């Protein structure tokens, strides 16, 4: 049974299988809703759009980001993100696949609680694990020690690890990343 990796980042959801080099699905974490008078009848009008479909039709959609600064605020949009990334992007059954999920350090614990509860009840799995992104970045570097500066779209955090031992008193999180740079460029 192949395990699943699903980095639910603030900007871009990146999901795929173990033992693979490139991520199978990389798509932005947006849920769109229509904001205009639907005048045409039929033709497959949806109540919501997830992912690249919301990116294509973005002229007539209010786009919502369910993750801000690493914290999942809206949860049914997050469930729609997970249902899309399980059943459309990857086209797999979550009932037969363990799932590793990523998380920023110094997160609220209730995010982990509700992530565990939804991921064990709505999309019920054999098993699950929540990791830290910088440790996986040090894994991809292939080395032992060092300080990892991981900077996504919401979270920029430094994690120092020496000889496979993290130092939790020296984790430095800052909520300044690419979305703030996008707002500043605006």
């Amino acid at each position: 049974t192949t395990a699943l990796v699903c980095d639910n980042g603030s900007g871009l959801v990146k999901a795929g299988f173990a033992g693979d080099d490139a991520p199978r699905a990389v798509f932005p974490s947006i849920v769109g809703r229509p904001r205009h008078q639907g005048v045409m009848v039929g033709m497959g009008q949806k109540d919501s759009y997830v992912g690249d479909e919301a990116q294509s039709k973005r002229g007539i959609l209010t786009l919502k980001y369910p993750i801000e600064h690493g914290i999942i605020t809206n949860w049914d949009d997050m469930e729609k993100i997970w249902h899309h990334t399980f059943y459309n992007e990857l086209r797999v059954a979550p009932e037969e696949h363990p799932t590793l999920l990523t998380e920023a350090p110094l997160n609220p614990k209730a995010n982990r609680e509700k992530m565990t509860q939804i991921m064990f009840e709505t999309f019920n799995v054999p098993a699950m694990y929540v990791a830290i992104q910088a440790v996986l970045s040090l894994y991809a570097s292939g080395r032992t020690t060092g300080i990892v500066l991981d900077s996504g779209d919401g979270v920029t955090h430094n994690v120092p690890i020496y000889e496979g031992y993290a130092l939790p008193h020296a984790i430095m999180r800052l909520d300044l990343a690419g979305r703030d740079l996008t707002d500043y460029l605006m």
Binding site: G19, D20, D21, Y139, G142, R143, T144, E163, G164
Partner: peptide
């Protein structure tokens, strides 16, 4: 005493996972 004297690895694991992909 005369009778006694007459008697006398992060690196290997991570590179393994890299080559597994």
């Amino acid at each position: 005493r005369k009778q006694q004297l007459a008697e006398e690895c992060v690196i290997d694991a991570l590179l393994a996972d890299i080559r597994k992909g």
